Amino acid sequence: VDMYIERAGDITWEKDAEVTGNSPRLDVALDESGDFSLVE
Amino acid sequence: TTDGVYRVMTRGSTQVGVGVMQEGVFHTMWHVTKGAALRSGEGRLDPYWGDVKQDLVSYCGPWKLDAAWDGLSEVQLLAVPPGERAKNIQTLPGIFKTKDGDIGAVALDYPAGTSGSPILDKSGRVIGLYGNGVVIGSYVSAITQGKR
Ligand SMILES: Oc1nc2ccccc2cc1CNC[C@H](O)c1ccc(F)cc1F
């Protein structure tokens, strides 16, 4: 399986970017396999 | 080797992820490559450091990205969607509260092939990578940053 990379752009902030998404506060746990899960 | 954001492809071709080239080191999420060597033109990038729990991997050298979310300001996801040009999405992160401290998190739900896309602060520094998270139907991604 040929896995390869291609450049897609500069690392830059864009002034006129679309803005969206909320800002949830969540209690989570991180297990040994790197999986996050919700905690109550 | 040029600094920038890159697609991670496999072979028809499919985009499995995204990564960041900085200071000669390629940075992506472990689950994107599972540590496999990467082709870059005629050259080969070999894995250098990786950690399944952090879900991170670096190629050609140690992890170089060390900026962190300031906990107050909006950030930008520099997404590279499969089949589309790189584009920026601005958002205010939420928070993952863990027993080991808080982690910034972005409530943005984009195609799996965007995993590894960088999240930036206002100065253009990479504060982490997108694509390891939880579901609350909506996906929320940790802002995953390594250690330099
Ligand atoms: O608006 C649309 N319009 C559509 C119209 C027809 C069919 C499909 C359609 C999908 C969309 C949504 N496209 C999102 C974009 O691909 C993207 C932008 C930022 C990012 F971070 C990651 C992304 F994948």
Record the tokens describing residue B114, joined without a space: 């965007």
- Paired residues of B17 in beta bridges: B8
Write the DSSP string, chain B.
--SEEEEEEE---EEEEEEEEETTEEEE-HHHHTT--EEETTEEE-EEEEETTTTEEEESSS--------SSS-EEEEE--TTS--EEEEE--EEEEETTEEEEEE-----GGGTT-EEE-TTS-EEEES--EEE---EEEE-B----
Beta partners for B10? Answer: A3, B14
DSSP-based three-state secondary structure for A22: coil
Question: Would you call B26 and A20 a contact, using CB atoms and an 8 Å cutoff?
Answer: no
Residues A24, B136 contacting (CB under 8 angstroms): yes
Say which experimental method was used.
X-ray
Residue ranges per structural domain of chain B: 4-59, 75-142
Determine, for residues A3 and B142 on separate chains, whether the beta-carbon distance falls below 8 Å.
Answer: no
- Rounded (5°) CA angle B116-B117-B119: 120
Catalytic annotation on B100?
A: no
The residues near A35 (Cβ < 8 Å, ≥ 6 apart) are: none
Query: What kind of architecture, by CATH, is found in domain B75-142?
Result: Beta Barrel (2.40)
Note the resolution in Å, 1 decimal. 1.6
Catalytic site includes residue B31: yes
Name the region of B116 (left: φ>0; alpha: ψ -120 to 50; beta: rest). left
Neighbours of B2 (CB within 10 A): 8
Total Cβ atoms within 10 A of residue B66: 12
Whether B55 is catalytic: yes
> A1 in helix, strand or coil?
coil
Q: Where are the domains of chain A?
A: 2-40
8 Å CB contact between B57 and B50:
yes
Both structure tokens of A14: 């864009």
The upper half-sphere exposure of residue B68, i.e. CA atoms within 13 Å in the direction of its Cβ, equals 8
Size of interface A-B (CB pairs under 8 A): 158
**Residue B146 at interface with chain A, using a CB cutoff of 8 Å:** no
Q: In the CATH scheme, what is the code of domain B4-59?
A: 2.40.10.120
For residue B72, what are the contacts with CB-CB under 8 A and spacing of at least 6? Answer: none
Q: Quick one: which of A10, A8, A13 has its CA closest to B121?
A: A13
Separation between Cα atoms, residue A12 and residue A1, nearest integer Å: 32
Cβ of B4 and A10 within 8 Å?
Answer: yes
